[PDB]
């Protein structure tokens, strides 16, 4: 009854502590110049797990901290980033801070703001350094803003109307809710069973087709006026 999260927290707090201990040990055993692939994968997985739990429960500070570390561990495990003793020490410091953040949440307290800013700043500095100063040669030197500024602003008047015919009880509300995830519906005629709305053109006909297609079918879909 009533999905209370202030106990689905306990299980997360315990899992996280355990994963932080594993992370620490793997970090300490890593050989920077020749990191065992299986060991890095374990560190990355612990971080990925902690991040998802942090997101699920709205532990903002922990989520962002783990997020930045995870991207870095992904680079190192894919072999895109070289490790060394400085980087491993930064990871250990990151593990230390994440533990402090977790310990604050266990007490229904807020984590340390200053430690959060410092660790995120350092992690983003490393990622930057892991870049060799922007990509080679100029990129997106044109492909960007293409077709100049359209004449009117957003299609002269060819939105195409989508007609969703034949919807179910609560589907009106729900598909209203789903189309509402992909695009935005106007002139929402919530018939007893229908939903018409005008369509923006923001998705290839071939793709809208594809997703509604998670709840409905290709012919329920008509594009016309």
């Amino acid at each position: 009854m009533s999905m209370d999260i202030s106990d689905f927290y306990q299980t997360f707090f315990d899992e996280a502590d355990e994963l932080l201990a594993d992370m620490e040990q793997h970090l300490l055993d890593l050989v920077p110049e020749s990191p065992d692939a299986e060991q890095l994968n374990a560190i990355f997985r612990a971080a990925h797990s902690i991040k998802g739990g942090a997101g699920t429960f709205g532990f903002t500070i922990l989520q962002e901290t783990t997020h930045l570390m995870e991207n870095l561990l992904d680079e190192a495990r894919r072999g895109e980033m070289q490790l060394n003793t400085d980087i491993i020490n930064l990871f250990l410091e990151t593990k230390d801070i994440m533990q402090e953040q977790l310990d604050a949440y266990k007490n229904s307290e807020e984590p340390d703001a200053a430690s959060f800013e410092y660790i995120c700043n350092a992690l983003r500095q490393l990622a930057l350094e892991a870049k060799g100063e922007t990509p080679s040669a100029v990129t997106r030197l044109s492909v960007v803003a293409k077709s100049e500024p359209q004449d009117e602003q957003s299609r002269s008047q060819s939105p195409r109307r989508i007609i969703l015919s034949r919807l179910k009880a609560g589907e009106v509300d729900l598909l209203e809710e789903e189309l509402g995830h992909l695009t935005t519906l106007t002139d929402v005629v919530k018939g007893a069973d229908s939903l018409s709305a005008i369509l923006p053109g923001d998705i290839a006909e071939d793709d809208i087709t594809a997703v509604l297609c998670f709840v409905i079918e290709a012919d329920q879909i008509t594009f016309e006026t």
Partner: protein
Amino acid sequence: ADKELKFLVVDDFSTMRRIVRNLLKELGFNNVEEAEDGVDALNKLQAGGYGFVISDWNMPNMDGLELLKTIRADGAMSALPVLMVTAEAKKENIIAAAQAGASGYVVKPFTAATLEEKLNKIFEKLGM
């Protein structure tokens, strides 16, 4: 609506796997298996028996979609329902999921009551 449907809860995270499990519980679903990745899952799937992949989008060796495309260019697994579990309701995920062939999507954490509704519609569209 088989309270026994074999959920391959593909995720590399245990507690979540556990509440997913407990909510499935307060809702009545109790048959849940856990996998940690796409090669593991593909290996696991190269086996068979899996009916619902509640696949988290991300995993090592092979992820949710390669899992899904390989699944799709391969004669044998080409049509499994994959409920991509996503932490958030996003369009391209939703569409790539769509163009490479995925079945549906859900957002954690849900109450027993919500998980309840999503399952219902896939079931609906696939004819389950």
